[PDB]
Amino acid sequence: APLPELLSNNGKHALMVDGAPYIILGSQTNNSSNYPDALKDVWPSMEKMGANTLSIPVAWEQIEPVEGQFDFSFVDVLLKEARQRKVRLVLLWFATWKNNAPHYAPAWVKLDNARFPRVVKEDGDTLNSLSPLGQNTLAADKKAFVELMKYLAKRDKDHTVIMVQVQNEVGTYGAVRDYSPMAQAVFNAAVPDDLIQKLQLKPGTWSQVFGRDADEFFHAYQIARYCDEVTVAGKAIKNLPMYVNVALRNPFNPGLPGQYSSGGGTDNVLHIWKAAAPNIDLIAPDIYFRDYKTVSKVLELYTRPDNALFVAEIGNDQPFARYLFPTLGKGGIGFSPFGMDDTDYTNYPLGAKVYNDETIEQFAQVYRLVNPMMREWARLSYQGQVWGVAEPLDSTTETQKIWNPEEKEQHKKDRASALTQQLDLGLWDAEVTYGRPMFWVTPPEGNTPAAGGALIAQLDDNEYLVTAYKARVEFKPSQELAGKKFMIERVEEGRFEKGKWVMERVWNGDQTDWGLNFTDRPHLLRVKMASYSVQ
Numbered sequence: 001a002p003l004p005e006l007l008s009n010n011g012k013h014a015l016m017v018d019g020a021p022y023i024i025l026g027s028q029t030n031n032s033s034n035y036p037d038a039l040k041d042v043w044p045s046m047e048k049m050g051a052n053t054l055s056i057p058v059a060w061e062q063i064e065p066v067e068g069q070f071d072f073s074f075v076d077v078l079l080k081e082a083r084q085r086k087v088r089l090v091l092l093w094f095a096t097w098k099n100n101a102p103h104y105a106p107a108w109v110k111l112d113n114a115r116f117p118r119v120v121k122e123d124g125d126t127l128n129s130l131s132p133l134g135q136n137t138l139a140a141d142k143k144a145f146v147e148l149m150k151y152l153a154k155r156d157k158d159h160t161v162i163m164v165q166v167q168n169e170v171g172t173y174g175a176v177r178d179y180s181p182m183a184q185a186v187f188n189a190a191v192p193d194d195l196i197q198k199l200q201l202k203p204g205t206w207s208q209v210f211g212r213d214a215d216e217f218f219h220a221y222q223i224a225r226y227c228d229e230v231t232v233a234g235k236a237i238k239n240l241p242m243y244v245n246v247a248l249r250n251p252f253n254p255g256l257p258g259q260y261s262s263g264g265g266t267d268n269v270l271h272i273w274k275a276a277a278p279n280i281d282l283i284a285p286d287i288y289f290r291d292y293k294t295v296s297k298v299l300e301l302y303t304r305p306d307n308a309l310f311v312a313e314i315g316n317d318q319p320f321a322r323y324l325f326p327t328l329g330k331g332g333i334g335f336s337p338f339g340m341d342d343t344d345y346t347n348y349p350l351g352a353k354v355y356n357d358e359t360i361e362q363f364a365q366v367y368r369l370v371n372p373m374m375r376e377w378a379r380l381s382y383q384g385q386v387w388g389v390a391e392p393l394d395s396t397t398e399t400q401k402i403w404n405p406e407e408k409e410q411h412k413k414d415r416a417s418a419l420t421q422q423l424d425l426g427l428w429d430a431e432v433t434y435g436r437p438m439f440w441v442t443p444p445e446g447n448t449p450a451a452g453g454a455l456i457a458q459l460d461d462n463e464y465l466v467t468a469y470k471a472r473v474e475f476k477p478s479q480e481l482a483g484k485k486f487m488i489e490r491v492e493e494g495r496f497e498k499g500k501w502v503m504e505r506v507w508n509g510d511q512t513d514w515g516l517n518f519t520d521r522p523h524l525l526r527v528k529m530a531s532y533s534v535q
């Protein structure tokens with residue numbers, strides 16, 4: 001069985017699993033489900049969701065509760081139960097940092113500050129965040145991580161585990177960096193040549209080179225070097241893909257480092273992280289912004305020639321489900337809503353106020369569009385041209401409903417324009433619209449709540465794979481046609497069996513007169529367009 005691998009070529013990416021591109025249609029447990037007794041409350045949600053991959057913590061405190069005394073009993077049960085359900089796993093190594101803090105480090109780590117030191121603020125107070133310059137802390141984390149990877153090397157030959165997250169939301173809240181004597185000695189000293197070279201900057205100390213950014217860039221660099229060393233040590237045992245997940249700063253209006261988690265892979269320090277940690281496969285955003293513009297900005301910033309897009313976490317409230325479409329449209333390798341278990345917890349206001357079957361169903365509905373073509377989509381995303389869009393107005397607020405005669409008419413025109421998206425597919429364009437009948441051309445009014453989206457993959461110059469949700473998709477020529485006319489040549493609904501297209505029916509007549517109209521039900525279409533002479 002070939003190792004999973006992240007491939008990067010011509011600014012595109014694939015997560016290879018069993019020798020072909022793979023899409024993580026993911027779900028992540030709540031933070032306290034990493035025990036055998038809790039798995040009963042995880043699997044039903046995962047089945048209801050139709051997820052193909054489970055993200056779940058493996059805690060340093062549980063594998064090494066007494067120094068040198070390893071316990072992999074949780075990993076044994078998890079591997080067995082995952083294999084029984086024919087799903088894959090992403091293990092989340094909760095160790096030196098989990099949300100900036102050492103709460104998941106063993107008692108013998110997190111209660112020994114002298115051996116395993118904390119960030120010291122400028123004012124001399126201590127924060128509950130382990131310093132990335134703690135050399136004992138790095139050696140201990142690395143040692144335990146190596147034992148976890150040795151367990152997988154010996155006990156996971158078919159790679160049930162496809163990827164490992166190293167730490168969880170690293171950084172520091174309440175200070176920009178470590179100002180300890182140990183840290184100041186490194187801050188005051190030369191910026192390492194390797195960083196100075198990769199960023200093409202003039203040599204000097206951190207303050208000289210980075211000015212107003214020296215504190216933040218220094219924390220980012222030391223944490224990236226720490227995480228890179230743990231990653232290299234684990235890969236030397238078994239070379240799985242490994243990644244870090246970011247406690248995002250607001251990309252538009254971030255405020256100050258330490259209000260957000262300073263030193264994590266935030267948008268302003270991706271250049272430091274990529275320079276400092278070449279062994280970490282990707283930097284994954286954890287998305288809890290609900291509003292379309294900010295989520296779209298995060299997807300743009302984290303999709304780079306040097307960075308595969310993996311939405312390692314997203315809120316589990318209804319508005320987040322539609323972001324699967326732009327994630328995959330950007331060539332994303334996966335998408336993993338957070339808190340998908342029945343362990344009596346909700347992270348509202350980040351996620352759903354209520355966790356029930358309806359919560360899960362909002363993600364199940366969009367996964368049902370991708371599951372039937374997962375391997376074909378993954379190959380097209382890597383090897384070719386894909387597109388994906390989500391409904392670009394958020395649900396109307398109570399404010400807007402009350403606080404909104406000729407204006408009503410104007411407001412409806414502005415919303416209809418905003419709810420109309422253009423995609424350039426080469427010789428053909430698609431126009432995607434949201435919240436309108438399946439017949440005639442009444443302008444779009446949006447879904448209540450906002451929920452729609454569309455996926456398109458190019459099969460050939462004039463042929464597209466299309467699936468969409470609570471939306472209309474219409475094709476037109478991309479360029480003026482010089483006397484020719486155009487039509488849909490053929491729309492087929494079907495599926496892939498053993499990688500071969502099987503037609504179920506032809507969409508025609510009402511079904512293609514008014515664009516291609518999708519509801520909540522899955523339909524996978526092959527759309528062939530034609531220009532023709534009327535000479």
Ligand code: NA
Binds near residue numbers: 014
């Ligand atoms: Na891709």
Ligand code: NA
Binds near residue numbers: 425427479
């Ligand atoms: Na074009």
Ligand code: NA
Binds near residue numbers: 424479
């Ligand atoms: Na064009």
Ligand code: NA
Binds near residue numbers: 504523524
């Ligand atoms: Na079908």
